């Protein structure tokens, strides 16, 4: 990914994360737990869905037969037809290849972007209360129970509540 | 935006910001003030202008009439002409749609990039003197008058001047 999160500083994906694209995995006195983030997951889904809406569609132009499979047309005009058709085949094959390559590059970079955005959103939330690990983990200095972890996920987390304890723990 | 600043952590745009694309809004003892940043604004403008220079241009190829609107050509050759023209219409309509979609994606991501670059440039300027809010705001710990705010905008700001006061305020 262009941003360097997916297949980047985040070592690998979670096969257990079946409910979402992106999620949180925590460690605290109470144990371990994993939860998907739907806002980031939905943003990625909506954008991929948009590409498919664009690519799966009508070319309303209807083309009639201009040659004949049973009784071949004159050879001069027939050769012009075939040359023109083969030229169009070449253009469209090239177009299709480039479209899919371009869209795939963007799709991968897009997913990588959404992962990065979620990470940075969390980093800003708990400023001066935690430090970046480098594996996509935040080491939190104060005690953070399941209600505290769920507040981070929820986005209600209040850093000023735990700042004195966390800051002083450095 | 791909970076997640515009329509991202920055909640919304400023209708009052009429002189620039990107700008600063401050709060200090002296009150509130808004100012546009031209270097970031110009970079975005120059890049959009570049796209338009590319897209608004000459196709020097000149095409003559090959059929006749008043006295219709032979039906076989006429059908070949129409099939070929309609095939070209299909190619160009597809090309135009994809060009504009691709360019628009990039244009939006480009603007989002320039906003992010300006934010990160400021963050680096006042390292250890302020903290990221999360709304695109920097909470500055030391007293920062209009000359101090204008130094940040100008890019002359000297963090070592106010570091003892700001650091100790944590």
């Amino acid at each position: 990914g262009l941003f360097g999160a997916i297949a980047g500083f985040i070592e690998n994906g979670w096969e257990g994360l079946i409910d979402g694209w992106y999620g949180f995995r925590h460690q605290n006195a109470q144990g371990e737990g994993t939860a998907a983030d739907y806002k980031s997951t939905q943003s990625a889904i909506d954008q991929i869905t948009g590409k498919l809406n664009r690519l799966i569609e009508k070319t309303n132009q209807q083309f009639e037969l201009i040659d004949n499979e049973f009784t071949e047309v004159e050879k001069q005009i027939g050769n012009v037809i075939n040359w023109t058709r083969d030229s169009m085949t070449e253009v469209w094959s090239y177009n299709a290849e480039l479209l899919v390559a371009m869209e795939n590059q963007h799709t991968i970079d897009l997913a990588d972007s959404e992962m990065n955005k979620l990470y940075e959103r969390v980093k800003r939330q708990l400023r001066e209360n935690a430090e970046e690990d480098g594996t996509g983990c935040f080491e939190i200095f104060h005690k953070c129970d399941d209600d505290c972890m769920a507040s981070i996920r929820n986005n209600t987390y209040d850093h000023s509540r735990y700042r004195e304890e966390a800051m002083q723990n450095r | 935006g791909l970076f997640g600043a515009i329509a991202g952590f920055i909640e919304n745009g400023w209708e009052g910001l009429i002189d620039g694309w990107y700008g600063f809004r401050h709060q200090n003892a002296q009150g509130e003030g808004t100012a546009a940043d031209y270097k970031s604004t110009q970079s975005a403008i120059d890049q959009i202008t570049g796209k338009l220079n590319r897209l608004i241009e000459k196709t020097n190829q000149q095409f003559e009439l090959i059929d006749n609107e008043f006295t219709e050509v032979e039906k076989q050759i006429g059908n070949v002409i129409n099939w070929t023209r309609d095939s070209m219409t299909e190619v160009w309509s597809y090309n135009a749609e994809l060009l504009v979609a691709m360019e628009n994606q990039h244009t939006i991501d480009l603007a989002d990039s320039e906003m992010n670059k300006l934010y990160e440039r400021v963050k680096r300027q006042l390292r250890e003197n302020a903290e990221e809010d999360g709304t695109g705001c920097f909470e500055i710990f030391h007293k920062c008058d209009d000359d101090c705010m204008a130094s940040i905008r100008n890019n002359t700001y000297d963090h070592s001047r106010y570091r003892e006061e700001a650091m100790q305020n944590r």
């Binding site: 096969e15 257990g16 079946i18 409910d19 979402g20 694209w21 997951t41 889904i45 991929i48 | -």
Partner: protein
């Protein structure tokens, strides 16, 4: 043609363990493209997800916060089934329990928790009341005739009634049970038939009360 078949007792004493089983056919309990859930329903609480298990190169389980301290859902890969175990039950656990597959149906490979197939349901009653058998009495016909069977004084729900071992369905009405002041249930099953067929056709209601292992047939005649 996936089919989820549910078994287990529908009566559990308070403080003891509710144990149910869902047997899968047409798909694998350890399939990458399935998630195996339990959901319950009560006229009060409505529909409530309880928990799940699934395999993705290792077994995972998730449970609803409301039952997390009491609940276990385990796969059996020998019999292609998965179970529900609920410890320390209270009257608030009285409900219909359903097993259900999700994550077969997905948005771009992300389980979106669509429950595409459900089991038939198991009605579970938490009570210290011993089960009782249901008495079955004929409701005799005295050009359309109505006849029926009164299924009286049983506990707990449910009772099932068929006619002529399921050969007669048209015009059959089996009423929802009523709880009597005695604390026992009662219901009737009725059918309308041509009055002419009374002299030739035999009418027998077949009554099943699985909690008491009661299966009774009753001939209904004029």
């Amino acid at each position: 043609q996936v089919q989820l078949q549910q078994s287990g007792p529908g009566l559990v004493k308070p403080s003891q363990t509710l144990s149910l089983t869902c047997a899968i056919s047409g798909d694998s309990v350890s399939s990458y493209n399935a998630v195996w859930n339990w959901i319950r329903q009560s006229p009060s609480r409505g529909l409530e997800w309880l928990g799940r298990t699934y395999y993705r190169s290792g077994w995972y389980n998730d449970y609803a916060e409301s039952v997390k301290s009491r609940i276990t859902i385990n796969p059996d890969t020998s019999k292609n089934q998965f179970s529900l175990q609920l410890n320390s039950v209270t009257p608030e656990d009285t409900a219909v329990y359903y097993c259900a597959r999700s994550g077969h149906i997905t948005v771009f490979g992300v389980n979106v928790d669509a429950f595409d197939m459900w089991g038939q349901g198991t009605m579970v009653t938490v009570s210290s009341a011993s089960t009782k058998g249901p008495s079955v009495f004929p409701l005799a016909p005295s050009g359309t005739a109505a006849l029926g069977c009164l299924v009286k004084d049983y506990f707990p729900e449910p009772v099932t009634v068929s006619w002529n071992s399921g050969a007669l369905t048209s015009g059959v009405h089996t009423f929802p049970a009523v709880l009597q002041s005695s604390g026992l249930y009662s219901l009737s099953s009725v059918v309308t038939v041509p009055s002419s067929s009374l002299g030739t056709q035999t009418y027998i209601c077949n009554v099943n009360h699985k909690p008491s292992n009661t299966k009774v047939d009753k001939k209904v005649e004029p």
